[PDB]
Write a protein that holds these residues in place. Structure first.
Motif, mmCIF file in Angstrom:
data_model
loop_
_atom_site.group_PDB
_atom_site.id
_atom_site.type_symbol
_atom_site.label_atom_id
_atom_site.label_comp_id
_atom_site.label_asym_id
_atom_site.label_seq_id
_atom_site.Cartn_x
_atom_site.Cartn_y
_atom_site.Cartn_z
ATOM 1 N N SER A 183 -0.368 3.164 13.668
ATOM 2 C CA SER A 183 0.368 3.981 14.624
ATOM 3 C C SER A 183 -0.561 4.920 15.395
ATOM 4 O O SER A 183 -1.469 5.507 14.832
ATOM 5 C CB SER A 183 1.482 4.780 13.938
ATOM 6 O OG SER A 183 0.990 5.927 13.270
ATOM 7 N N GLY A 184 -0.315 5.048 16.692
ATOM 8 C CA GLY A 184 -1.113 5.896 17.547
ATOM 9 C C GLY A 184 -0.270 6.992 18.142
ATOM 10 O O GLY A 184 0.944 6.874 18.228
ATOM 11 N N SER A 185 -0.931 8.057 18.574
ATOM 12 C CA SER A 185 -0.261 9.247 19.049
ATOM 13 C C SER A 185 -1.163 10.029 19.987
ATOM 14 O O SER A 185 -2.378 10.037 19.831
ATOM 15 C CB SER A 185 0.120 10.122 17.857
ATOM 16 O OG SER A 185 0.814 11.290 18.260
ATOM 17 N N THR A 192 -4.862 10.243 18.268
ATOM 18 C CA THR A 192 -5.120 9.776 16.920
ATOM 19 C C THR A 192 -4.619 8.351 16.725
ATOM 20 O O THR A 192 -3.698 7.903 17.402
ATOM 21 C CB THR A 192 -4.512 10.708 15.823
ATOM 22 O OG1 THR A 192 -3.082 10.694 15.898
ATOM 23 C CG2 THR A 192 -5.018 12.141 15.962
ATOM 24 N N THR A 194 -3.548 6.315 13.249
ATOM 25 C CA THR A 194 -3.320 6.402 11.824
ATOM 26 C C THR A 194 -3.131 4.985 11.301
ATOM 27 O O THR A 194 -2.322 4.233 11.832
ATOM 28 C CB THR A 194 -2.085 7.268 11.523
ATOM 29 O OG1 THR A 194 -2.315 8.609 11.994
ATOM 30 C CG2 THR A 194 -1.774 7.294 10.028
ATOM 31 N N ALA B 153 0.003 13.230 16.002
ATOM 32 C CA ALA B 153 0.394 13.304 14.596
ATOM 33 C C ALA B 153 1.093 12.018 14.157
ATOM 34 O O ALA B 153 1.675 11.313 14.977
ATOM 35 C CB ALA B 153 1.293 14.504 14.361
ATOM 36 N N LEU B 154 1.022 11.720 12.862
ATOM 37 C CA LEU B 154 1.711 10.569 12.283
ATOM 38 C C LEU B 154 3.165 10.545 12.756
ATOM 39 O O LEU B 154 3.865 11.547 12.642
ATOM 40 C CB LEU B 154 1.653 10.628 10.749
ATOM 41 C CG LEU B 154 2.289 9.465 9.983
ATOM 42 C CD1 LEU B 154 1.536 8.177 10.265
ATOM 43 C CD2 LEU B 154 2.348 9.735 8.483
ATOM 44 N N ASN B 155 3.604 9.411 13.307
ATOM 45 C CA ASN B 155 5.001 9.226 13.738
ATOM 46 C C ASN B 155 5.513 10.268 14.740
ATOM 47 O O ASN B 155 6.685 10.608 14.721
ATOM 48 C CB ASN B 155 5.942 9.207 12.523
ATOM 49 C CG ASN B 155 5.534 8.187 11.467
ATOM 50 O OD1 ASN B 155 4.988 7.123 11.778
ATOM 51 N ND2 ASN B 155 5.814 8.506 10.211
ATOM 52 N N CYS B 156 4.631 10.780 15.594
ATOM 53 C CA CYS B 156 4.997 11.747 16.624
ATOM 54 C C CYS B 156 4.405 11.248 17.909
ATOM 55 O O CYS B 156 3.227 10.955 17.960
ATOM 56 C CB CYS B 156 4.458 13.149 16.326
ATOM 57 S SG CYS B 156 5.222 14.456 17.368
#
Ligand SMILES: [Cl-]
Ligand SMILES: [Cl-]
Ligand SMILES: [Cl-]
Ligand SMILES: [Cl-]
Lengths: 232, 191
Positions: A183-185, A192, A194, B153-156
């Motif tokens: 997952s990216g953000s 980031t 993750t 952030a994770l899942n954001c």
């Protein structure tokens, strides 16, 4: 399934010329732009050139401008790069890549070009340089851009000596086939990636790429490597 | 030709909005003559639904609501009744019972550049699909479980992306200006 098979590597001397080929299959080659990207020994990916779907528009990174000519033959489904007057700075593995509007969604295997016998870009800073973890753990990789790219970031996975493989487009959207543990953000400069519940096949180098600020640039990578040494 | 609807102020607008922040102009008290636009070589998409498909070459008095926005070529097909996808779901939604016209045209020459025009945007994340003709111009971080968070952030996630429009890419990734016409018949009697 989209396939890109490259040919025409080998070692040359400075000032000499080479042509790289990239034969495409499994897609309507004539509908897509095609890019060249290269990777100097043990370093990051650099964008070389792009040709339009119909071969009429051509654009080049400043560094190879005037001596690299990109071309395509739409009947043969082949893309070419004529590399004239080669320098030591050109020594690289070269990659053809299918365009996803300046993200790169399918990559050829790469061809090494060794030129050795003599002889305002947006910067993407990845941290940490390496990340040493065990399977089942969470990797958190960072990519700070020098200027804002908004959400125009993509991430790639590169196994040792193999072609980069897209993970994420537009900061947060997974490429086809990519499981949801990736997952990216982020939007702007702070990004980031993750990788939760790390799997054996996730150990690789990870590259962030921006497409919106010209020319397209890549970070120097984060190596996610298996943790040597138990952790008491 | 008694007060024809001035469509040229809509279709020839210098600037079009992003599909997430799609704009409506109402053209009031005029005879819809969209039949003249069908005649044009100008449009790549032209689909009328319901009564607009029957009165296509007809001339009649109405108010016209024109919805303007830009989308990718592969996204144009989403501007239709019953369609699903990030544009259909989270940006612009036509009703299943839609009775108007959808017009689109290739704007590579004005909406794409050599280095990429990134001014146009769409939304890719939302809590729930839009209702027909609903509009969301919010820019609030999204998370699956709906708890507040700050990217990265994770899942954001930030919910807006850019279209990247280049003169090098194929029609599917090229820019299309889109205009949706809804017609509202004007009744004569008093209130
Ligand atoms: Cl795509
Ligand atoms: Cl409205
Ligand atoms: Cl067209
Ligand atoms: Cl294309």
């Amino acid at each position: 399934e989209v396939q890109l098979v490259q040919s025409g590597g080998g070692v040359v001397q400075p000032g000499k010329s080479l042509r790289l080929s990239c034969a495409a299959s499994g897609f309507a080659f004539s509908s897509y732009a095609m890019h060249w990207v290269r990777q100097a020994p043990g370093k990051g990916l650099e964008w070389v050139a792009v040709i339009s779907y119909d071969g009429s528009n051509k654009y080049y990174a400043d560094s190879v401008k005037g001596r690299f000519t990109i071309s395509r033959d739409n009947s043969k489904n082949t893309l070419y790069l004529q590399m004239n007057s080669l320098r030591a700075e050109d020594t690289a593995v070269y990659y053809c890549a299918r365009d996803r509007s300046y993200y790169l969604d399918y990559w050829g295997q790469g061809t090494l070009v060794t030129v050795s016998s003599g002889g305002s870009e947006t910067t993407l800073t990845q941290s940490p340089a390496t990340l040493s973890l065990s399977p089942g753990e969470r990797a958190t990789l960072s990519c700070r851009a020098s200027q804002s790219v908004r959400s125009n970031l993509a991430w790639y996975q590169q196994k040792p000596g193999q072609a980069p493989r897209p993970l994420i487009y537009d900061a947060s959207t997974r490429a086809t086939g990519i499981p949801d543990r990736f997952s990216g953000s982020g939007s702007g400069t702070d990004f980031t990636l993750t990788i939760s519940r790390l799997e054996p096949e996730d150990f690789a180098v990870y590259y962030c790429q921006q497409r919106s600020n010209w020319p397209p640039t890549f970070g120097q990578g984060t190596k996610v490597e298996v943790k040597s040494g138990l952790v008491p | 030709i008694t007060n024809l609807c001035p469509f040229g102020e809509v279709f020839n607008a210098t600037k079009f909005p992003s599909v997430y922040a799609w704009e409506r102009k109402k053209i009031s008290n005029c005879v819809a003559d969209y039949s003249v636009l069908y005649n044009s070589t100008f449009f790549s998409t032209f689909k009328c639904y319901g009564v607009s498909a029957t009165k296509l070459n007809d001339l009649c008095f109405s108010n016209v609501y024109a919805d303007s926005f830009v989308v990718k070529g592969d996204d144009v097909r989403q501007i239709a009744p019953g369609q699903t996808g990030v544009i259909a779901d989270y940006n612009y939604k036509l009703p299943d019972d839609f009775m108007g016209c959808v017009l689109a045209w290739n704007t590579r020459n004005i909406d794409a550049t050599s280095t990429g025009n990134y001014n146009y945007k769409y939304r890719y994340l939302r809590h729930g699909k839009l209702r027909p003709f609903e509009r969301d111009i919010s820019n609030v971080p999204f998370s699956p479980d709906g708890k507040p968070c700050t990217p990265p952030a994770l899942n954001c996630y930030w919910p807006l992306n850019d279209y990247g429009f280049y003169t090098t890419t194929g029609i599917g990734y090229q820019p299309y200006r889109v205009v949706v016409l809804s017609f509202e018949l004007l009744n004569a009697p008093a209130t």
